[PDB]
Ligand binder design. Structure first.
Ligand SMILES: Cc1cc2nc3c(=O)[nH]c(=O)nc-3n(C[C@H](O)[C@H](O)[C@H](O)COP(=O)(O)OP(=O)(O)OC[C@H]3O[C@@H](n4cnc5c(N)ncnc54)[C@H](O)[C@@H]3O)c2cc1C
Ligand SMILES: Cc1cc2nc3c(=O)[nH]c(=O)nc-3n(C[C@H](O)[C@H](O)[C@H](O)COP(=O)(O)O)c2cc1C
Length: 635
């Protein structure tokens, strides 16, 4: 079953699309491309997760299979978890791939140093080992906001290659469903086999199954009770939530520095606007059953299920709208005046960006703009199941210590929310869910901007439970507790660093010899947004002279805006002294600006302190990253 070649043949497929994805974008692109290849070119396509196959025989792939690799870069130039075994195979075991025909699209972000390392590496190694690159490599940049249009441009070039180099006939895009829906008017919420949004089918049967026992992963979460929450900012307009999850009654395990994945549900406001857009407002309790029309299509949620459960618990209805979604759905436009507007917007990259993307429209808002509020009632709900990405967990840096509190997981989440001039709320799904929980749990009297179902499917999320799982990270304290560490994490970057500090505090209490800990923190104003302000002196009391903390306030004084890199420079003698003692550097938080400014500042310190050029020092600091002496948890 893990032989991909045998799987292609058995399913009568001639086209393989492989996705390396951590948060689902690469998977969604592979699905989008697959459907278009099938409709426009008649290709018999299979979308595959690298993790579902073993790769030892892949060198035997035949010339009649076209392979598309859609691959994200993660961590520090590393493969996505699902692609790790393929990456080990290609880099270490693969010999030749003499009849492979392939093309690669990389997903990455140019604010990271190893930009699109994986797409570039796959594309190069596949060629070096004898593969035939049939369409040029291209890559997308999530750091500058061009990723989606980069993908569209690459896809256009792939289609040119198919049509003009391989002489395939290209037909017009048409919706060719891979799934069939049937309404079950005989079923209702009263029927226990009907999903009301449970995370998977194990949560629907579960009469005498232990839902507290292992293992928990991206296919199977633990419903973790939130025992307490706290608003950490004093600002009325900007919020950050401390969350404590009780895991004591379960086999869910974590280690300091790991990530918690929180499984979302959508807000009432976004659901309402989605149902209005598609004429589903009187159908939300109606039960549907889904059947695959293609032997390699996996229905992405339990069936049977209600429309409302699919929309609330399974579809990523919010977020930037791909122009490819406009192109795919245009055939279902409700009327001619709409089709004219919608076809124009879908075909013009720049006007799409101005009229849809920069307004931060969700699907529902963009389609209703285009149709002057006429519902898109001709859109088959199957089309939406296939063309909107599955609602994916968000990761949080755990802020508790597994040594100190093995039975609790903390996270520290800044809430993303704004209102547009036209009154629309533009919200982060998970973070507004956590804010709603904090408001309700603490009876705060704040009015939530958007609202969620805090009880969940059949009341199964009651007493403020959410589905979670833990992802193991390589962001880890040194094996040797006497090794000094330098911890840099302004804003929510402090989250894993709180975990680290709490671990070292407990270690000192366990009579362990712990090395020096230097922490560089920053926020706007000591009286506004200083995370965990009270705790740090308590930690200092335990750790003694083996802990020093320096704080940078960016807004306290307008004449002197101060950031963590300014405090690192001010304390350069100490920082470098610790580096000479083998200190490990950990940088956490904002990838876009902070991480790069900090790295530059550290490089300058190394250059001055060691009498080497700035570029030689920069290259040395880069080698520390490769060697895991300089670690990042930046997003
Ligand atoms: C390894 C890792 C560790 C992390 N650690 C932490 C941490 O410790 N703490 C923390 O706070 N975060 C952390 N994050 C970030 C976190 O995973 C989330 O990305 C963040 O909390 C936002 O999630 P959300 O569901 O609220 O927002 P999302 O729903 O993903 O929305 C993202 C943004 O898009 C905006 N938006 C919504 N709709 C639209 C639209 N139509 N057009 C344009 N924009 C729109 C939202 O308002 C928001 O600003 C980490 C990320 C990673 C990868
Ligand atoms: C924690 C983290 C680390 C990342 N590391 C890199 C990197 O080293 N190089 C890069 O080009 N992009 C990097 N990215 C950008 C992702 O590849 C990019 O957001 C991509 O679109 C995600 O695709 P996915 O949703 O399929 O996982 C990183 C993103 C995150 C969140």
């Amino acid at each position: 079953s893990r032989d991909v070649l045998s799987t292609l043949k058995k399913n009568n497929k001639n086209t393989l699309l492989l996705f390396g994805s951590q948060t689902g974008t690469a998977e969604d692109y592979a699905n989008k491309l697959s459907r278009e290849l099938h409709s426009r070119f008649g290709l018999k396509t299979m979308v595959a997760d690298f993790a579902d196959y073993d790769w030892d025989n892949f060198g035997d792939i035949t010339e009649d299979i076209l392979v598309f690799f859609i691959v994200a870069t993660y961590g520090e130039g590393e493969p996505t978890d699902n692609a790790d075994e393929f990456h080990t195979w290609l880099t270490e075991e693969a010999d030749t791939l003499s009849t492979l025909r392939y093309t690669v699209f990389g997903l990455g972000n140019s604010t990271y140093e190893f930009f699109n390392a994986i797409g570039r590496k796959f594309d190069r190694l596949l060629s070096e080992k004898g593969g035939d690159r049939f369409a040029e490599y291209a890559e997308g940049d999530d750091g500058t906001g061009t990723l989606d249009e980069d993908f569209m441009a690459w896809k256009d070039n792939v289609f040119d290659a198919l049509k003009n180099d391989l002489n395939f006939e290209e037909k017009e895009l048409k919706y060719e469903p891979n799934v069939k829906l049937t309404e079950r008017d005989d079923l209702s919420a009263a029927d226990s086999q009907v999903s009301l949004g449970e995370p998977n089918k194990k949560y629907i049967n579960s009469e005498g199954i232990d839902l507290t026992k292992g293992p928990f992963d991206h296919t199977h979460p633990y419903l973790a009770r939130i025992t307490e929450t706290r608003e950490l900012f004093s600002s009325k307009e900007r919020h950050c939530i401390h969350v404590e999850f009780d895991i004591s009654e379960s086999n869910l395990k974590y280690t300091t520095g790991d990530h918690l994945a929180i499984w979302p549900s959508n807000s009432d406001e976004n659901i309402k606007q989605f149902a209005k857009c598609f004429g589903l407002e009187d159908k939300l309790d109606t039960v549907i059953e889904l059947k695959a029309l293609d032997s390699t299509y996996t229905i992405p949620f339990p069936t049977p299920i209600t429309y409302g459960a699919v929309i609330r618990h399974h579809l990523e209805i919010s977020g930037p709208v791909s122009r490819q979604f406009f192109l795919s759905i245009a055939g279902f436009a409700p009327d001619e005046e709409t089709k004219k507007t919608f076809t124009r917007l879908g075909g013009d990259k720049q006007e799409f960006a101005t009229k849809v993307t920069r307004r931060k429209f969700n699907i529902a808002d963009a389609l209703l703009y285009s149709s002057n509020n006429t519902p898109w009632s001709d859109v088959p709900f199957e089309f939406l199941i296939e063309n909107i990405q599955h609602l994916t967990p968000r990761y949080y840096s755990i802020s508790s210590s597994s040594l100190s509190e093995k039975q609790l997981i903390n996270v520290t989440a800044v809430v993303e929310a704004e209102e547009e001039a036209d009154g629309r709320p533009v919200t982060g799904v998970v973070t507004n869910l956590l804010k709603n929980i904090e408001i309700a749990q603490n009876k705060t009297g704040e009015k939530p901007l958007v609202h969620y179902d805090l009880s969940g499917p059949r009341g199964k999320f009651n007493k403020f439970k959410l589905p979670v799982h833990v992802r193991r990270s390589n962001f880890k304290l040194p094996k040797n507790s006497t090794t000094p560490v330098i911890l840099i994490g302004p804003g929510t970057g402090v989250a894993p660093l709180r975990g680290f500090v709490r671990e070292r505090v407990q270690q000192v209490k366990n009579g362990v010899n712990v090395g020096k800990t230097l922490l560089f923190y920053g926020c706007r104003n000591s009286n506004e947004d200083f995370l965990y302000k009270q705790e740090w002196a308590e930690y200092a009391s335990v750790l003694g002279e083996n802990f020093e903390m320096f704080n940078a306030f960016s807004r306290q004084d307008p004449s002197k805006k101060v950031y963590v890199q300014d405090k690192i420079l001010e304390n350069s003698q100490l920082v470098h002294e610790l580096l000479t003692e083998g200190a490990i550097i950990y940088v956490c938080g904002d990838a876009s600006r902070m991480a790069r400014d900090v790295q530059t500042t550290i490089s300058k310190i190394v250059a001055k302190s060691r009498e080497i050029s700035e570029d030689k020092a920069a290259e040395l600091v880069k080698s520390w990253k490769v060697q895991n002496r300089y670690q990042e948890d930046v997003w």
